[PDB]
Design a protein around this ligand. Structure first.
Ligand SMILES: CO[C@H]1C[C@H](O[C@H]2[C@H](C)[C@@H](O[C@@H]3O[C@H](C)C[C@H](N(C)C)[C@H]3OC(C)=O)[C@@H](C)C[C@@]3(CO3)C(=O)[C@H](C)[C@@H](OC(C)=O)[C@@H](C)[C@@H](C)OC(=O)[C@@H]2C)O[C@@H](C)[C@@H]1OC(C)=O
Ligand SMILES: [Cl-]
Ligand SMILES: [Cl-]
Ligand SMILES: [Cl-]
Ligand SMILES: [Cl-]
Ligand SMILES: [Cl-]
Ligand SMILES: [Cl-]
Ligand SMILES: [Cl-]
Ligand SMILES: [K+]
Ligand SMILES: [Mg+2]
Ligand SMILES: [Mg+2]
Ligand SMILES: [Mg+2]
Ligand SMILES: [Mg+2]
Ligand SMILES: [Mg+2]
Ligand SMILES: [Mg+2]
Ligand SMILES: [Mg+2]
Ligand SMILES: [Mg+2]
Ligand SMILES: [Mg+2]
Ligand SMILES: [Mg+2]
Ligand SMILES: [Mg+2]
Ligand SMILES: [Mg+2]
Ligand SMILES: [Mg+2]
Ligand SMILES: [Mg+2]
Ligand SMILES: [Mg+2]
Ligand SMILES: [Mg+2]
Ligand SMILES: [Mg+2]
Ligand SMILES: [Mg+2]
Ligand SMILES: [Mg+2]
Ligand SMILES: [Mg+2]
Ligand SMILES: [Mg+2]
Ligand SMILES: [Mg+2]
Ligand code: NA
Ligand code: NA
Ligand code: NA
Ligand code: NA
Ligand code: NA
Ligand code: NA
Ligand code: NA
Ligand code: NA
Ligand code: NA
Ligand code: NA
Ligand code: NA
Ligand code: NA
Ligand code: NA
Ligand code: NA
Ligand code: NA
Ligand code: NA
Ligand code: NA
Ligand code: NA
Ligand code: NA
Ligand code: NA
Ligand code: NA
Ligand code: NA
Ligand code: NA
Ligand code: NA
Ligand code: NA
Ligand code: NA
Ligand SMILES: [Sr+2]
Ligand SMILES: [Sr+2]
Ligand SMILES: [Sr+2]
Ligand SMILES: [Sr+2]
Ligand SMILES: [Sr+2]
Ligand SMILES: [Sr+2]
Ligand SMILES: [Sr+2]
Ligand SMILES: [Sr+2]
Ligand SMILES: [Sr+2]
Ligand SMILES: [Sr+2]
Ligand SMILES: [Sr+2]
Ligand SMILES: [Sr+2]
Ligand SMILES: [Sr+2]
Ligand SMILES: [Sr+2]
Ligand SMILES: [Sr+2]
Ligand SMILES: [Sr+2]
Ligand SMILES: [Sr+2]
Ligand SMILES: [Sr+2]
Ligand SMILES: [Sr+2]
Ligand SMILES: [Sr+2]
Ligand SMILES: [Sr+2]
Ligand SMILES: [Sr+2]
Ligand SMILES: [Sr+2]
Ligand SMILES: [Sr+2]
Ligand SMILES: [Sr+2]
Ligand SMILES: [Sr+2]
Ligand SMILES: [Sr+2]
Ligand SMILES: [Sr+2]
Ligand SMILES: [Sr+2]
Ligand SMILES: [Sr+2]
Lengths: 172, 337, 142, 160
RNA sequence: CGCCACACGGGGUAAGAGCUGAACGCAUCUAAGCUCGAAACCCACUUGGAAAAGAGACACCGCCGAGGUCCCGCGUACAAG
RNA sequence: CGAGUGGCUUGCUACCUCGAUGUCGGUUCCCUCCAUCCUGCCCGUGCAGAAGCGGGCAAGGGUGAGGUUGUUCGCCUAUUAAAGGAGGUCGUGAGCUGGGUUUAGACCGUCGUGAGACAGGUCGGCUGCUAUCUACUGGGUGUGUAGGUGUCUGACAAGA
RNA sequence: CUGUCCCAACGUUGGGCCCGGUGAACUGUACAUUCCAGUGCGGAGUCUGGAGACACCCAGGGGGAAGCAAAGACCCUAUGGA
RNA sequence: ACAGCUGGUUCCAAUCGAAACAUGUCGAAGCAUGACCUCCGCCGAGGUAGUCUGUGAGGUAGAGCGACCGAUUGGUCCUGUCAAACUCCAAACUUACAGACGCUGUUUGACGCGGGGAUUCCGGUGCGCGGGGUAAGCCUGUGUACCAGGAGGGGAACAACCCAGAGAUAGGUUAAGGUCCCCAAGUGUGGAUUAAGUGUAAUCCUCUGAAGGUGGUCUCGAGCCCUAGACAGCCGGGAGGUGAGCUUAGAAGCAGCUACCCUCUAAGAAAAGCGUAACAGCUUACCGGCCGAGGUUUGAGGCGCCCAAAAUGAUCGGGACUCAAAUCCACCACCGAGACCUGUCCGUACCACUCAUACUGGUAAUCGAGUAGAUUGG
């Protein structure tokens, strides 16, 4: 098979070996696209993902590579934005971005601050009880947004009663 | 159902054979943080006395109160760093490159070494700098000896030579620091490396106890009850099962005890000084009188009196340093009584 | 330090066993072989299992011993020993006339033998000997 | 006792009751189930449970598989639903057990089994088109309580 | 029976919690990829270890002399050695 | 009801040894297995919390002291994070112990005409050997590497 | 009442170790530096596969040689014995 | 002393070469008599290990039972199952005699008869068929080949699994098995599958892996829907009579009972699923739009995956192997025995010559392994 992807006017994409770099007005995203007998190349105006094999496993990755490149285009133009809301029931949770890491203080009454590191060129902006995770690489944004939701993970007690934590409001 | 029990003795300090060098050899060194410096010093064990202290620990309910602490006295006279050895990073680990020596030698260093008469300190230094340019230079260490002549109680005049590491800033700045100490006369004191209150690692070759049995060597039981009178008192039950048809090296057997290298971790330096303040009345039993550069190390230190012990800043400390502890009283009372 | 090699083989992106099988046959034919870039040598399959086979070989032993090397240096050397009758006079001479090296300490580039190369573009399920050694707990000196 | 002791057909045919005494009665209640008054030809769909290996099935297994099959048909189609199931195999082979060591080894009679050849119909249920997926499930529960692997073969089903 | 000392942290994982993601327009933690994650593993730390047959490295001293052994006085050592 | 895994129990068989492979129990000392009792990280809950209940990964470490009994097993007590189970010739008598089974003495009950018997009970009733080889623990002497002194490196090895 | 035990320590005497002198025995098909597995009459230093292994010597406690020692004292068999 | 019991019994070679079974036995660790091995003398022309045909014998397999017999279902003829000690049927096959061909015997005398000497009567394994037993490296039959008493080649090692039955020596070609290395010969060819290191394990105490499960992946068939736009997703619509009636304080798609009708319209239930005290609220059916190419249902096969826990150190013999060094389908070339072919010699047997068993010449495709044991030369 062969799937040709037309690159938008805002974007320019270079490629060497197995690594694809996609540059645009919102930033730069570099990913490695490696799979048996699948060739990803730049035709100046289009990105070609082709293979000689048409089996289910190869076909699965041709489709995954497409949605990865398509996502890199939308990332370098409009960008990726995840929205979050901080909720608490008794203890006022102090969420703050300190350095290259988003730190949550006084969660569920804890003296010790819970902290996770931000992945790459992802920007986390706080405006009270609302958080907006944004950036060009979906891999980075998606995970940083997830890391925050996972930072308030509670296993010891009932989730239905102890509902405190930052949660994903808007998925792009 | 036969109760469980941990094995007799540790398998980590094996094999329990005699030490190759009576002078201890460190296998680990501290990390490169602050200002460049020699990562260790050495002295000669003198004996034990107690010291009264003021509790430094902020988390102790006794903070500020009188407290008795057992202390071992070690005579630590200035050492001489006679050379700068350089190592290169090879595909087979670290290997020595060249050495930068000196002209000033201690009167009796020829009792151990074949003292250099003709050396090129410049071509040696050049090889090290051309290797640093190449990005092949590993670490920087100094060849160092002791002046046992400065210690009257120790019979030997033959210096104990040992290598020590210099860590600190950049590899370029510590090369300079290293060469700078050597080019003079290589003289340095414990004040140059340590400060009272810091945690140090003391290495030593233990008190030699010759050949001893399992009860002393591995701490196995003695034969109990009726078994004790049968002809077997201090011998273990068996040397292993039927199968495997061999004796494992893990079964407690007789042999050499003592005269083993031990690196005792996290030893507090209570005080570093000079003179006769820690000496005991009538002299230290089986040693002598202390009058000169010393160090008071908290608790026990491996080895007997007169033996050479080595120092190093703790590679893994548990507590944060509480510098220069207040000494209210050092006992001088005779160790005979 | 200096080895008068007749043949210098490049193990980079080459299937270890296939190279070793040829390096054995040549060693018994009187050639003085030298295997180069063994850190970058390849072994195909699922990494997880390959590591388990080698990790077990490290943990296996007793008082008599079973010395299994952790570095990619010795791992390749042992593989070659496995294809040679090393207890016999003719086999020990052959084995000792074969030496494995990390990187390329020579001036010449090594030759890649026929049918030994792995096409990276066609394969994703393999490991580098350096990857195996890093997992075994060896010191990365390459 | 496990079926491993009696599943194979390696022993001779031992059925002659005129020479065998003390044979325990069959644990099987009935072979004719459902609406036993209606005919087998009155149904558009005929599904049989076919045994794939040549085995000996005990009366207890025959009952345990029949029970958990018909109980599902009673649950889904009611106690008087429009179906009829038949267990066509009967436990004729008499089983022994040596329960003294190997001396006078010929055992005492402990039970009965049914010699079913491969490809043979053990069960056969006749139903209407709508109730077809219920009977295919009655057999899925029934094949789980016998010894061989089985086939659920539809003999009169062009309705799919 | 007394007294001193005996971490933390990294790296990769299991169960598991997730991210991006296709086969299968959707959905999906997995198929390619990725973020985490056990007293367990690897490193760290302690001990041994030139007989590692690829049998090692450096510095200096010496090849008519460097160094060593025996000898003598003794032990920080020791059943002989 | 059906399918299996293990090889701790018991049973079967009678392949191995009757010119002898020392018993049960215990003890001592070593290694191991996981089907995990505790400890770490998890999932579910009839998960508010606290205390549990069930399940997953997991064998690093731990799993102890006692009263009756020769007991293994088991019963019982107080502690405990928990006081898991199993293999190593039912690990271990050229290591120990010798309380039980199972010699010769004797009693009781039952059986027998009787000698005497008992898969009944009971009291008493022995523990050999100077290590040739191998194995391991520690200690030396030589040879190889091919003059010496001093300092190191680190393939691998051990640790809870 | 107490080292029987918790839980072991130190000491005394004779040995043990080194030296002079004296000077046996047990045991021996052969070969023999082993180890992990496997196989085999089903319980192998010797077979098969791998692993390890430079030689010689001193001391030790006894894991293995189904260690040494006694033509099993149990059990069965003999047209045995008392 | 006696013993049916253990041990031992001393030189070379050549020919043939067993029995571990039957009857009797105070017999079962022993004997005798037969089977069977060997040796001698006799007889004198046939013999029968194979096959075909002819003339006979037979009730095991299978099958079947309103064909006997006896088990063994249900219904208001029909309908459901069985047999070592059942048979209306019925093989393969074994077996008597005869003929034919083959092979064999008439100087190597067969078939047979008579006599001397035994050994032997603990057997074992594979395959086929068995009977017993949960099973067994179990016990006990039977036919057969093998080990025992059988080398050599292969199988990692290994009495009986494969090749192969073997005088000496020598050249050659093969057999089983093998050709990536160890290790002789292919990193051979055409094509496909597997990603688990599955596997690289004929047979097996020995090499496990089951019921059950699998949108892991490959291949093949059937049905249905689809550019008049399918499958999915996303958008919009999902409406009026009326909140159907009855039930009930209330019930209005949705507690329950019965019905389940007709308008508008391109659709839209007297409502399939949650939800409310009852409403409301959320999608389902159903229609339209965007979109644009195959989609959906079911059947069958291939390889793999889950199921899958054990004790000193993991394993296909080891290394190690992934478009293979695995698996399946074809194919090409080779390696590889003491087999087969071939030169010489030896022994033995027989023939010619001979007094000779002395020489000489000849024949052996149809001679050459062997424990106990019989016979013979040294
Ligand atoms: C089991 O109890 C032993 C106790 C003792 O054992 C023997 C002595 C050990 C015995 O050895 C053991 O005998 C058992 C019957 C069988 C056992 N085997 C199964 C192993 C055998 O070996 C053992 C038990 O280890 C003894 C027979 C040895 C030997 C050579 O035969 C013998 O007779 C010598 C002259 C011995 O004298 C006697 C009277 O035995 C001496 C060497 C002495 C000094 O040594 C002994 O006495 C030791 C105490 O005496 C035996 C007769 C007993 O046997 C039985 C069944 O009870
Ligand atoms: Cl004891
Ligand atoms: Cl080891
Ligand atoms: Cl070899
Ligand atoms: Cl791949
Ligand atoms: Cl033959
Ligand atoms: Cl593998
Ligand atoms: Cl002769
Ligand atoms: K015995
Ligand atoms: Mg709780
Ligand atoms: Mg004192
Ligand atoms: Mg005092
Ligand atoms: Mg488990
Ligand atoms: Mg453990
Ligand atoms: Mg007690
Ligand atoms: Mg035992
Ligand atoms: Mg023993
Ligand atoms: Mg003894
Ligand atoms: Mg008693
Ligand atoms: Mg008694
Ligand atoms: Mg004894
Ligand atoms: Mg023994
Ligand atoms: Mg006897
Ligand atoms: Mg007796
Ligand atoms: Mg008598
Ligand atoms: Mg003869
Ligand atoms: Mg002859
Ligand atoms: Mg039949
Ligand atoms: Mg025989
Ligand atoms: Mg070859
Ligand atoms: Mg396998
Ligand atoms: Na004694
Ligand atoms: Na023993
Ligand atoms: Na591989
Ligand atoms: Na190893
Ligand atoms: Na009986
Ligand atoms: Na970690
Ligand atoms: Na089993
Ligand atoms: Na058993
Ligand atoms: Na015991
Ligand atoms: Na554990
Ligand atoms: Na008890
Ligand atoms: Na035993
Ligand atoms: Na004893
Ligand atoms: Na015992
Ligand atoms: Na005492
Ligand atoms: Na021993
Ligand atoms: Na007699
Ligand atoms: Na008989
Ligand atoms: Na007899
Ligand atoms: Na048949
Ligand atoms: Na004829
Ligand atoms: Na017989
Ligand atoms: Na034969
Ligand atoms: Na063989
Ligand atoms: Na494998
Ligand atoms: Na013979
Ligand atoms: Sr035990
Ligand atoms: Sr050092
Ligand atoms: Sr070290
Ligand atoms: Sr005793
Ligand atoms: Sr053994
Ligand atoms: Sr080759
Ligand atoms: Sr059978
Ligand atoms: Sr019996
Ligand atoms: Sr089944
Ligand atoms: Sr996971
Ligand atoms: Sr050396
Ligand atoms: Sr737990
Ligand atoms: Sr007591
Ligand atoms: Sr028991
Ligand atoms: Sr009891
Ligand atoms: Sr006793
Ligand atoms: Sr009794
Ligand atoms: Sr009793
Ligand atoms: Sr040599
Ligand atoms: Sr001894
Ligand atoms: Sr006797
Ligand atoms: Sr017959
Ligand atoms: Sr090929
Ligand atoms: Sr192919
Ligand atoms: Sr076996
Ligand atoms: Sr099999
Ligand atoms: Sr299956
Ligand atoms: Sr497990
Ligand atoms: Sr012959
Ligand atoms: Sr012959």
């Amino acid at each position: 098979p062969r799937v040709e992807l037309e690159i938008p006017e805002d974007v320019d994409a270079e490629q060497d070996h197995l690594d694809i770099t996609v540059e645009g007005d919102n930033g730069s995203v570099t990913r490695r696209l490696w799979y048996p007998d699948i060739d990803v190349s730049v035709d100046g105006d289009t990105v070609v993902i082709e293979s000689d094999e048409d089996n289910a496993k190869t076909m699965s990755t041709i489709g995954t590579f497409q949605s990865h490149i398509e996502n890199m285009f939308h990332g370098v133009t409009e960008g990726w934005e995840y929205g979050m809301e901080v909720f608490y029931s008794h203890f006022p949770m102090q969420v703050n971005v300190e350095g290259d890491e988003v730190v949550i203080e006084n969660f569920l009454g804890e003296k010790a601050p819970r902290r996770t590191t931000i992945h790459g060129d992802t920007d986390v902006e706080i405006d009270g009880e609302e958080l907006t995770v944004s950036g060009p690489d979906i891999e980075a944004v998606g995970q940083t947004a997830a890391d925050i939701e996972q930072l308030t993970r509670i296993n010891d007690k009932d989730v239905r009663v102890f509902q405190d934590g930052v949660y994903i409001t808007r998925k792009p | 159902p036969q109760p469980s029990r941990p094995r007799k003795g540790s398998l980590g300090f094996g094999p329990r054979k005699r030490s190759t060098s009576e002078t201890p050899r460190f296998n680990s060194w501290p990390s490169d943080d602050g200002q460049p410096g020699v990562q260790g010093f050495a002295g000669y064990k003198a004996g034990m006395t107690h010291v009264v202290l003021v509790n430094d620990e902020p988390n102790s309910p006794r903070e500020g109160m009188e407290e008795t602490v057992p202390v071992t006295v070690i005579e630590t006279p200035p050492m001489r760093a006679v050379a700068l050895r350089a190592y290169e990073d090879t595909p087979y680990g670290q290997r020595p490159l060249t050495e930068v020596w000196t002209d000033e030698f201690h009167s009796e260093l020829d009792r151990t070494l074949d003292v250099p008469e003709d050396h090129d300190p410049d071509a040696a230094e050049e090889q090290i700098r051309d290797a640093h340019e190449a990005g092949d230079l590993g670490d920087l260490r100094l060849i160092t000896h002791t002046v046992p002549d400065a210690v009257p109680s120790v019979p030997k005049k033959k210096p104990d030579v040992m290598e020590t590491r210099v860590g600190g800033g950049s590899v370029s700045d510590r090369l300079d620091h290293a060469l700078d100490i050597v080019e003079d006369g290589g003289e340095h004191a414990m004040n140059d490396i340590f400060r009272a209150g810091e945690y140090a690692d003391v290495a030593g070759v233990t008190k030699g106890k010759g050949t001893q049995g399992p009860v002393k060597r591995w701490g196995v039981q003695k034969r109990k009850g009726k078994h004790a009178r049968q002809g077997w008192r201090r011998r273990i039950g068996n040397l292993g099962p039927w199968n495997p048809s061999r004796v494992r090296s893990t079964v407690p057997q007789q042999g050499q005890t003592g005269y083993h290298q031990r690196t005792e971790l996290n030893k507090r330096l209570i005080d570093i000084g000079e003179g006769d303040e820690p000496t005991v009345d009538g002299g230290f039993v089986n040693y002598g009188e202390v009058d000169g550069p010393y160090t008071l190390v908290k608790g026990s230190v491996p080895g007997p009196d007169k033996r050479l012990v080595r120092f190093r800043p703790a590679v893994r400390p548990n507590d944060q340093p509480r510098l220069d502890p207040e000494v209210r009283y050092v006992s001088n009372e005779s160790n005979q009584g | 330090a200096e080895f008068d090699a007749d043949v210098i083989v490049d193990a980079r992106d080459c299937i270890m066993g296939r190279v070793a099988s040829q390096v054995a046959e040549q060693a018994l034919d009187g050639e003085t072989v030298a295997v180069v870039n063994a850190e970058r040598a390849v072994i195909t399959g699922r990494e997880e299992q390959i590591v388990e086979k080698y990790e077990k070989r490290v943990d296996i032993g007793n008082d008599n011993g079973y010395f299994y090397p952790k570095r990619p240096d010795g791992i390749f050397k042992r593989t070659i020993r496995g294809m040679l009758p090393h207890k016999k006079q003719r086999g020990r001479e052959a084995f000792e006339s074969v030496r494995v090296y990390l990187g390329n300490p020579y001036d010449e580039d090594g030759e890649v033998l026929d049918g030994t190369s792995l096409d990276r573009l066609s394969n994703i399920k393999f490991v580098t000997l350096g990857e195996i050694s890093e997992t075994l707990g060896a010191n990365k000196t390459w | 006792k496990p079926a491993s002791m009696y599943r194979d057909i390696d022993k001779p045919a031992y059925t002659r009751r005129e020479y065998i005494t003390g044979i325990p009665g069959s644990k099987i209640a009935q072979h004719k189930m459902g609406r036993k008054q209606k005919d087998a030809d009155d149904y558009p769909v005929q599904i049989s449970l076919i045994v794939e290996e040549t085995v000996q099935l005990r009366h207890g297994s025959l009952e345990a598989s029949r029970l958990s099959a018909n109980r599902h048909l009673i649950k889904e189609l009611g106690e008087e639903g429009d179906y009829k199931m038949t267990l066509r195999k009967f436990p004729h082979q008499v089983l022994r057990e040596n329960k003294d060591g190997m001396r006078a080894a010929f055992g005492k009679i402990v039970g009965t089994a049914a010699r079913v050849q491969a490809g043979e119909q053990l069960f056969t249920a006749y139903c209407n088109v709508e109730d077809a997926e219920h009977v295919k499930e009655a057999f899925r529960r029934a094949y789980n309580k016998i010894t061989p692997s089985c086939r659920i073969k539809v003999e009169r089903g062009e309705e799919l």
